[PDB]
């Protein structure tokens, strides 16, 4: 428990009170009192998702299409990944901008990613499992990617044994940036935040 | 997936769906319309749980008062664990019952425990991590535990082959199941269903 807004604003590195004992650990991974601290209203979980990764895969950036879209509350329960936000919000004075945190299972952070904003991650180590809470369904119809080594955006992607990423499909042919700005599907920040904006 | 109530009813196993590929593997651990299918409304998530236990670790057994009680939703994401619930629901055609299911992280099934039911279990393994969705804030003021080895209860816990279990203080001193039932913190089988039967 303390959670740290990112240089992305939105988008938060959450760490936990952890009590060890005898038995082991055990801890809080969220509470709605302490969600409702930071982010300012409680989270509906309408999905929650697992993903087990070997070293170098990666997993992003997506992001769902505003009405509605999809905060996403991140964490590692084995192994590690260097999970990246970035702010997608036309408008935004941090637009372009992104941040990572390092979710493992030694210090067990996670991160916050609010509505209408890309969100990815790359395994560090074999068996790294990600699980994380959704506020929608998923939806194909609108959910969208980009390219996570998409060159304006210039993710710092750390590699594994300085060997590249391995992606899915849909993954690695996702658009370009300015190719998903000119098709105009991108969030707006007066439109996330009115969004936001109820309570 | 597969949901299949167990003997208590009120308590499901749940199987998911596995997609593997290059990359390890994903599942939906939970959806909001596969959940909806068999406990007929949605979860309202208002806090979720994590822990590790080293072998041989028994937390539980564990209830919340009703209105509105603890509905928990609980996985194995590395190790194994031998969960159990307990009907002490009074009134209940099968009050006094108890049923298990086994988490792990090969077959990754999940037990749901709706409100009014009692609710622990057995690490097999070092480095098993539990993780639970909950329906409830923690409140110590209306949680209470009834001894995990209480002799009218009889649950079949899997390692008299080595050693007693280990517990916490609290989980230790649990009061018997006269001693709870006589003092009349038992949920009542017809108002956790009127509870429930409300969706």
């Not at 935004?92 to 901008?97: A, H, I, Q």
């Not at 699980?131 to 998923?138: D, F, H, I, V």
Request: aromatic share 10%; with cysteine; proline share 6%.
């Amino acid at each position: 428990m303390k959670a740290r807004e990112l240089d992305v604003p939105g988008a938060w590195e959450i760490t936990p009170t952890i009590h060890v004992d005898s038995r082991g650990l055990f801890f809080e991974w969220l509470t709605d009192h302490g969600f409702r601290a930071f982010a300012g209203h409680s989270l509906d979980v309408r999905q929650v998702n697992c993903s087990v990764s070997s070293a170098g895969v990666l997993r992003g950036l997506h992001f769902a299409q505003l009405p509605p879209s999809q905060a996403k509350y991140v964490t590692c329960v084995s192994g590690s990944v260097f999970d990246v936000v970035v702010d997608i919000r036309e408008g935004s004075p941090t637009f372009g901008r992104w941040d990572s945190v390092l979710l493992d299972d030694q210090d067990r952070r996670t991160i916050y990613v609010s509505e209408g904003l890309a969100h990815g991650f790359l395994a560090l180590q074999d068996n790294s499992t990600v699980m994380y809470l959704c506020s929608a369904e998923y939806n194909p119809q609108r959910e969208h990617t980009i390219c996570a080594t998409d060159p304006t955006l210039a993710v710092d992607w750390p590699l594994v044994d300085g060997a590249a990423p391995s992606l899915s499909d849909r993954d690695a042919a996702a658009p370009s940036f300015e190719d998903v700005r000119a098709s105009g599907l991108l969030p707006r920040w007066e439109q996330t935040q009115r969004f936001i904006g109820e309570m």
